[PDB]
Symmetry: D2
C-alpha cells in the first residue's frame, strides 16, 4: 500500500494466514502498550511530578504490556522479566498464545537517558489442556512472531515473522506506527563489534582471540569499530541496521551469560535469523535451545552471518 | 522546592545581571530550536512522507539553530559543524555574542536511532574589530555559557554557567523544560570507562596502560564497566550522571583527536569543570587550548576528578 | 471492566460478526484520518509556517479522509461536501461500502476557533452494477454505521452502529481513542433549545410557537436555556450529552433547510435514533427521505424524544 | 521574524527597561496555560481508564496559582475558585495583583465545548500590607489583560497599552506563535450573542435592541445569532468576526452573572484596546469601582457602533 501502518499490515498478514483474529488483536494491543511506554519514557507528565500544580518506569512498562495482552483475549501464558513466576491468564480472558517479554530492557542505565526498549516473543500454546509454564518452555524455533520496540532518537517497533522483518516508525503526532522498512535483511559482514570489554579478565580464550582479531586484523584489513550502548535493543538494532556482531558470551563468573533466553536472547535470535543473520550460544543456535526455566540465562553471539561464522571458527579451535 | 523552567531560570539570572537582555533572548532561542529539533528527531509527521494525505535531520537542525540565533538579535558570529566558514550575522540582527555549536552530534549513525544531541558554547565578542572568524578562536576558559541538548530516551538540556550546571527535562506534553537536577556535581570516582577500543592498535602507550588497569586492576578491586554509545552527547551525559571517564584519544588516523575543539571539546569541558570534574588533552586542560582554526581537532579525556587524575599520572609515566 | 480502544472494539465487533474486514479496515482507516485532522486542527507545526526554520484546513481534512478511505480497499463511492460530484474509486482499490462525509463541518468560522468536526455515514452498495452517484442516493435507514468526530475542548469520536452509540476520547499522548461512554442514550427530555434566531423574521409559524413555549413556558416550568455554537457537530453532541433539541428548520433563504441530508442530517439522525432520540423534517423522519441529489438539503429537528414530539404536535397544527 | 509569546514579552520589557517581574509573570502564566491546554485536550486520559490496570478547573486553579506564586512577581491573587484572595508568602511576593478565571465555562465541559482562562494584571498601588483592597481596583488601572481559548486550537490573546496581540499554541514544540499583531475590531458587525431563554426576565431595552436585530428597522440584513455559552469563545468570535456580546440584567440576575474582576473587566480591556466598547448599561466596565472580589456586573461589549446602538436604546428607556 501507499500508507501502510502497523494496523493495516497486521490485518493483511493474518487475512493472508486465514486466521481467527487473535494474533492481530494481540499485536495491536502490544502496539498500544508500546505507544504508552514510549510516552512515559519520553517523560510526558514529568512537570506534574515536580510541582507545576503543587503537590517505577519499568513497573509501569510491565503493567501496560500485561493489561493490554490480558485485555486482548488472545493470551493464556505470560512470562515477564518483572514476575518470578508465569502469569496464568484468568480463564475468561484466555486465548491461544504464549507471550514472553522484557517490558523495559536497559533501564539499568535509564537515568543517563540511554536508549531502552521492549522485547517480545509469541508462541502457540503447545498444550490442549491447562495453560502452564511449560507452554513458555519451547525453543526459539517454535516462535510465531518476535521483535522489539526501540525508544531512542525515535520510537521504532520491529516485527519479525516468516514473511520477514518489518520496521515501523512511531509518528507521535498521530499515534501511528508507519511501515518504513520492508523485509529488512542484514549485511553479510559488518565492521562493528559489540561487547562489554570490562569483563576482558573473565573472558573465554576463544572470545579473547576473536576480539584481538577485530582490533589487530590478520588480513592487514581495517580494524572494526566498537559500540556497546549497554541496552541490548539499541545494540541489536544497530547490528540489524548497520551490520556487525553483538556478544554477551559466557565468561567465568556467569557460565550461562546474563541475558535471558525466553524474552531477550530468543526474540533477538529470531529477528536476526529472519533478517539472514545468525545467533549461536557457542555450542548450538539460540533458537535450538530447549528451555528448562523461564528466567534461564543463555550466552549469545548474534549479528551478520560471516561475523558469527568467524567467531565460531575460533570457538571450535579452542573446543 | 518550587518548580522551575529553563525559561524562568534564564530570565531570573539575567534580571540579576541588570543587563542588555541579549543572552536571555539567545538562550530562549536555543531552547525553542531544541524543542523543534526534538520533535523532528522523534519523527512527528513522518506519516505525511508515507501517504497520510497524499496531497535532512542534521541539515534541518543547522537551519533551525542558525535561524533562531539570528532572530535573537544577540549573535554576531556563528560557527557550526556543518558550515566550513563562520557565519557573520546581518548587521540589522547583530549582537555581542559568538556561538559555536554542533547542531546534531552523532547523527552519522542516526539510521540506527542512536542517541544524538545539540552541543553549544557561547562566547562574547572580546574584540572591537569587524566581526570575523577570528572572534570564534577564543579559548574555552573565556566561555560565558555552554551545554548540550540530548535527544535520547528522553530529551534533556544541560546548561552550564558560572552559577553551576543545571539539568532540565523536556516535558513533551506542555513543551517546557522542567528543572530536575539543580547545581549538579560529578562523583569523585566512577566505575565506567568510555572509548572506542577498535583503535587499540594505534593507541598511545599510556591509554593502553590505563584501559588495562580498568580491565585488569591489580588492587584486588572491582574492574570497570565498558560503555560507548558512539555519540559524544550520550557518552558525556552518562559520565556526568553515573561518574567515570570518557576518552577520545589521539590515534594514527586523526592524530589530534577526531572530536572538534570549539563546538565538541570546549562545551563538554566547561560542563565537566563547572560540575567539579576535569577535562584534559593529555598535555593541557581543554579550556586552556588557544584555538587556531574553528574546525580544529583536539583529544579529550574528561569525567570524574580521580579517574582523570589516574589517567594523568599514567600520562606522566609515558612522557618527557 | 477492562479498558478498550476503537481499534480493538471495531476489530472484535467484526470478528463477532464473522466478517471480511472491510468495515473494520474502513472504520480504522477513517479513525487514522481523524487523528491526523485533529493534529492539524490543533495547529501542530504552525511554527514552521512562520519561519521557525527560515522557510486549507477543510481542504486538508477532505484530502486526508479521501486518500485514507481509498487506501482502505473498502469503498466504492465517496460523497463529500468539498466535491460537487461523487468519487468513484479506482477499480484496483475498490470495496463494497459507500461513505458520505463532511470532512470539517464548521470551517466557515474556523478563524474564531469554533468547535469543528468530521461527520460520516457508511452505506452498503446494494446495486450489483457499476459504481455511480446513484449508490449514494440511499435513504438513511439503510445506514450500516454513522458517526462523527468533534474537535473541541477535547477530540472525541462518536460511532453509532446497531449495537448502539459509543463515545471514544482521543488521548493525544498515545494517539488512541479510549472508550469512555458505552451504549449511550439521550435523556427523555432536556432544558436546552438550539437554533439561529436571527432567522426569526423568516420562521414558519410552527417554529414561532415552539420557541415561545421555551422562553415563555405555559407549564409554569422554568424556561429552556439557549445555546447555539453555529457548528452542527458541537450543537448535536451537546444535545446528545445534555439532552434537548437542535433545530435548523425550513425558512425563506434556504427554503427546504440548509444542512445537507446525506452527510449532515442522516448521520446525526442515525446517532440520535440509536441513542433513543428522534430526528425529523417536520413532515417525515430524516432517515425516511429518499434522496434525489447528493448535495440535497433538508430541514432537521432532533434530540430528546419528548422535546421532538412536543414540536411535532405544534407542527401538526400548522400543516396541510 | 518568527515571534513567540516568550520573545515578545522579553522585548517589550527590555524596551521598557523593566525590572523583569511582568515578563516573568506573563511567562509563568504562559507555562500554566500550556498545562491547562494539555489537561483540557485529555492527555493521559487512557491512564484514568485503566490502560496500565488502574478536577479540571481545580487543576487549572492549582496550575495558575502555583505558577504565579513561584513567579516572584505577584502579591495578591483572586480566583473564581477561591472565595477569598490569596496573599502570596512574603519570601516570594511581587508587585502585581492578578485576577483570573482559571477554566471559564467548564460548567458545560461534558459536551467538550470551548473553555478558557481569563486574567488581568494590576500594580499594587497601595503602601499597605497586601490585602483584598489591592484587587478592588477599577479596570482602568489594568497593566495587562486577556484570555486563553482552548477551542479547535489554543490561543493566548494578550492586551496591553501596545495593543491586542493574538498568539497560537503549536502543541508540537510548546510555543505560542504571533499569528495576528495589533488586532482591532470592526466598527459594526452582523452577529448578536446572548441567552434568549431569559427573555421573560429581560429589560425593556434588551428586548428592543434584540428585536431590532432579528426584525431590522433599516430594511437591512437581519443579524445572525451565535451563543456558545462560554465567554472566552463568544468574546473571541466578537473580536474576530465582530458584533455584540450581551450578558445583561434579567431577574434571577439583577446585577448580571459574569464577575467584574476576572471575567468582565479583563474582556472590557481587550475590547477597548481593539477599538471596541464594553458597558454595563450605566457606565463603562473599566470605570466601575468594585467593593467585592466576587462582585457581579452586566456586560454589553463588542463592535463600537453596535454597543452605541444598544446604549441609545437603553437611554430611550430612561
Ligand atoms: C507470517 C504471517 C503470515 C503469520 C501471521 C501473521 C499474523 N499477523 O500479522 O497478525 C496473523 N494474524 C493471525 C490471526 O489470528 O488473525 C494469524 C493466523 C493465526 C496463526 O496461525 O498464527 C496470523 C499469522
Ligand atoms: C553568565 C551567567 C552566570 C549569568 C547570566 C545569565 C543570564 N541568563 O541566564 O539569561 C544572563 N542574561 C543576560 C542578559 O541580560 O543579556 C546576562 C548579562 C550578561 C552578563 O552580565 O554576563 C546574563 C548573565
Ligand atoms: C454493524 C455492527 C452492529 C456490527 C459490526 C461492526 C463492525 N465494526 O465495528 O468494524 C464490523 N466490521 C465488519 C467487517 O467487515 O469485518 C463487520 C461485519 C460486516 C458484515 O457482516 O457484512 C462488522 C459488524
Ligand atoms: C504595558 C506594555 C505596553 C509594556 C510592557 C510590557 C512588558 N511585557 O510584554 O512583559 C513588560 N515587562 C516588563 C518587565 O517587568 O520587565 C515591563 C516594564 C515594567 C513596568 O511595567 O514598569 C513591561 C512593559
Ligand atoms: O551491564 P552489563 O553487565 O554489560 O549488561 C548489559 C546488558 O544487560 C542489560 O542491560 C539487561 O539488563 P537490564 O534490562 O536490567 O538493564 C542488556 O540490555 C544489556 O545488553
Ligand atoms: O565513530 P567513532 O570513531 O567512535 O567517533 C565517534 C564520535 O564521532 C562522532 O560521531 C562525531 O559526530 P558525527 O556523527 O555528527 O560526525 C561523535 O558524536 C562521536 O563521539
Ligand atoms: O450560520 P447558520 O445559518 O446558523 O448556519 C450554521 C450551520 O452552518 C454550518 O456551519 C455548516 O457548516 P460549514 O461552516 O462548513 O458551512 C453548520 O455546522 C451549522 O449548523
Ligand atoms: O449559562 P448561561 O446562563 O447562559 O451563562 C454562561 C456564562 O457562564 C459561564 O459559563 C461562566 O460560568 P462557569 O465558569 O461556571 O461555567 C460564562 O462562560 C458564560 O458566559
Amino acid at each position: 500500500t501507499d500508507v501502510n501502518t502497523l494496523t493495516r499490515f497486521v490485518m493483511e498478514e493474518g487475512r493472508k494466514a486465514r486466521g481467527t483474529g487473535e494474533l492481530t488483536q494481540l499485536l495491536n494491543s502490544l502496539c498500544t502498550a508500546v505507544k504508552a511506554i514510549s510516552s512515559a519514557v519520553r517523560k510526558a507528565g514529568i512537570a506534574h511530578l515536580y510541582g507545576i500544580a503543587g503537590s517505577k518506569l519499568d513497573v509501569l512498562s510491565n503493567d501496560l504490556v500485561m493489561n493490554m495482552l490480558k485485555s486482548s483475549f488472545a493470551t493464556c501464558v505470560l512470562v515477564s522479566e518483572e514476575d518470578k513466576h508465569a502469569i496464568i491468564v484468568e480463564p475468561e480472558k484466555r486465548g491461544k498464545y504464549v507471550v514472553c517479554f522484557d517490558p523495559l530492557d536497559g533501564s539499568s542505565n535509564i537515568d543517563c537517558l540511554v536508549s531502552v526498549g521492549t522485547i517480545f516473543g509469541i508462541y502457540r500454546k503447545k498444550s490442549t489442556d491447562e495453560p502452564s509454564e511449560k507452554d513458555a518452555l519451547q525453543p526459539g524455533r517454535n516462535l510465531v512472531a518476535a521483535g522489539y520496540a526501540l525508544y531512542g532518537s525515535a520510537t521504532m517497533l520491529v516485527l519479525a515473522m516468516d514473511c520477514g522483518v518489518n520496521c515501523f516508525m512511531l509518528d507521535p503526532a498521530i499515534g501511528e506506527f508507519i511501515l518504513v522498512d520492508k523485509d529488512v535483511k542484514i549485511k553479510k559482514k559488518g565492521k562493528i563489534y559489540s561487547l562489554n570489554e570490562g569483563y576482558a579478565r573473565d573472558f573465554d580464550p576463544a572470545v579473547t582471540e576473536y576480539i584481538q582479531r577485530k582490533k589487530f586484523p590478520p588480513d592487514n584489513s581495517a580494524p572494526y569499530g566498537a559500540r556497546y550502548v549497554g541496552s541490548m535493543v539499541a545494540d541489536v538494532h544497530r547490528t540489524l541496521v548497520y551490520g556487525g556482531i553483538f556478544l554477551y558470551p559466557a565468561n567465568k563468573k556467569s557460565p550461562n551469560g546474563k541475558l535471558r533466553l525466553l524474552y531477550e536472547c530468543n526474540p533477538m535470535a529470531y529477528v536476526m535469523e529472519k533478517a539472514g543473520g545468525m545467533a549461536t550460544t557457542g555450542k548450538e543456535a539460540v533458537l535450538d535451545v530447549i528451555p528448562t526455566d523461564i528466567h534461564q540465562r543463555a550466552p549469545v553471539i548474534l549479528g551478520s552471518p560471516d561475523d558469527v561464522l568467524e567467531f565460531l571458527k575460533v570457538y571450535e579451535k579452542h573446543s
